[PDB]
Write a protein that binds this ligand. Structure first.
Ligand SMILES: N[C@@H](CCC(=O)N[C@@H](CS)C(=O)NCC(=O)O)C(=O)O
Ligand SMILES: N[C@@H](CCC(=O)N[C@@H](CS)C(=O)NCC(=O)O)C(=O)O
Lengths: 184, 187
C-alpha cells in the first residue's frame, strides 16, 4: 500500500526520525514529502511527522509505530515493539515519557538531567543490545534523547555512551542521516 | 481471584492523567487500592519517571497513563472485560494519536497560547458531533482525556460551540469519572 511520510524540511525532528526508522526497519516502501516549518504546517495536530497509508492519515510517531506494527506484524515483518506483553508496556512507557517530559532540556533543567541520567544508568547494560534485549523503536528514541546528557553536569557512565553509539550506528538511522545530507 | 492492583496518584487528586488511569480500571470493573504521593516533593522506587500515575500490577510496575491504558487493555481484554481502546484498527490508531497529542502539546495552556488555543478548538469542532457519544462513537479512554483537556478552552478567547460543552458535560458524567470526583472529595 502506497505510503507517504510527511517530514520536517530540515530533517531534525527526533520524532520524524523515529517514524522513518520504523518504516525502514520494516522494509516498507515510502515517498517523503516535506513540510517547511516557519511556517507551512498551518494532519489533525498540525505537526510532523504525518503518515499517509493509502487513504488513511496519522500523526504522532508513537501512534505511527503502534499502527504499522499491527498492519505489518511479525513474523513476516520486523517488530518494532517487543513481543512480551509487559516488555511492550515498558517500551510504551519509555516512548511516552520521552515525548512528554525533559522539557527544560537551572533547578528544573538539573532535575531532568538527573532523571534522564538515572534512567540511562538503570536501563542500559553492556550485555543487552537495547534496553529490553532486542532493539525496539524505543531504543532509537532513548538514544536520541540521551544526547542531551552532553549539556548536563554529572558524569555519564561509558555503558551509556556505548549504547548511544550502538543505536546511532543502525543502518535505518544511517539512511536518515544520508537522507538529511542529500540537501545538498 | 485477579492479581492485586495498586494506583499511585497525586495526594490532591488534581492530575488529569491520574484520573485517566483511574477511569480505565473503573470502566473494566477491576479491584484496586489507591496510594498517594505528595508535592512538594515526595516523587523523589516504584516509578522510573517519578511522575504520577504509576500502576502496580501484582509485581509489575508501570508509569505513563497511556501505557497503563494499553497494558490493562491487553491483560484484561474484550470481550471478557470492557475495552478502553477502539476495536477498529484505524480507529484505535486515532485514539492513540489523540492520547499522545494531548500529552505532548498544548504546553502554553500570549501567541503560542493563541496557537494552542486555536489548535484545540479546531480539533474539538472537527471531532465532536452531537450524533456521536465519544469522538469515535463508542466511548474510549481518549474521550476522558480529551474532555479534561477541553476544559482549557475556558482560558482562551474564542467562542466555544455548545456541542463541545455538551461533550465535556457528557464525559464528566460517566460513573467512572464520578467515582473519581467522589474519591477526591473524600479528602
Ligand atoms: N509527540 C509527537 C511530537 C511531534 C512534534 O513535536 N513535531 C515537531 C517537530 S519539530 C513539530 O512539528 N513542530 C512544529 C509545530 O508544532 O508547530 C510525535 O512523536 O510525533
Ligand atoms: N505523560 C504522562 C504525564 C504524567 C504527569 O505529567 N504527572 C504529573 C502530575 S500533574 C507529575 O507527576 N508532576 C510531578 C513532576 O513531573 O515532577 C502520563 O500520562 O502519565
Amino acid at each position: 500500500k502506497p505510503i507517504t511520510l510527511y517530514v520536517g524540511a530540515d530533517y531534525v525532528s527526533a520524532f520524524a526520525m523515529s517514524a522513518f526508522v520504523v518504516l525502514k526497519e520494516k522494509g516498507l516502501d515510502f515517498e517523503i514529502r516535506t513540510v517547511d516549518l516557519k511556517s507551512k504546517q498551518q494532519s489533525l495536530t498540525r505537526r510532523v511527522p504525518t503518515l499517509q497509508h493509502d487513504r488513511f492519515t496519522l500523526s504522532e510517531s508513537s501512534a505511527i509505530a503502534e499502527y504499522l506494527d499491527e498492519v505489518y506484524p511479525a513474523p513476516h515483518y520486523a517488530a518494532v515493539l517487543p513481543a512480551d506483553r509487559e516488555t511492550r508496556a515498558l517500551a510504551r512507557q519509555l516512548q511516552a515519557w520521552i515525548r512528554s517530559d525533559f522539557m527544560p532540556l537551572g533547578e528544573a533543567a538539573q532535575l531532568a538531567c538527573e532523571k534522564l541520567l538515572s534512567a540511562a544508568d538503570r536501563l542500559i547494560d553492556d550485555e543487552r543490545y537495547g534496553v529490553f534485549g532486542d532493539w525496539c523503536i524505543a531504543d532509537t528514541d532513548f538514544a536520541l534523547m540521551l544526547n542531551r546528557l552532553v549539556a548536563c553536569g554529572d558524569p555519564v557512565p561509558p555503558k551509556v555512551l556505548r549504547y548511544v553509539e550502538r543505536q546511532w550506528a543502525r543502518p535505518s538511522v544511517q539512511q536518515w542521516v544520508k537522507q538529511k545530507r542529500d540537501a545538498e
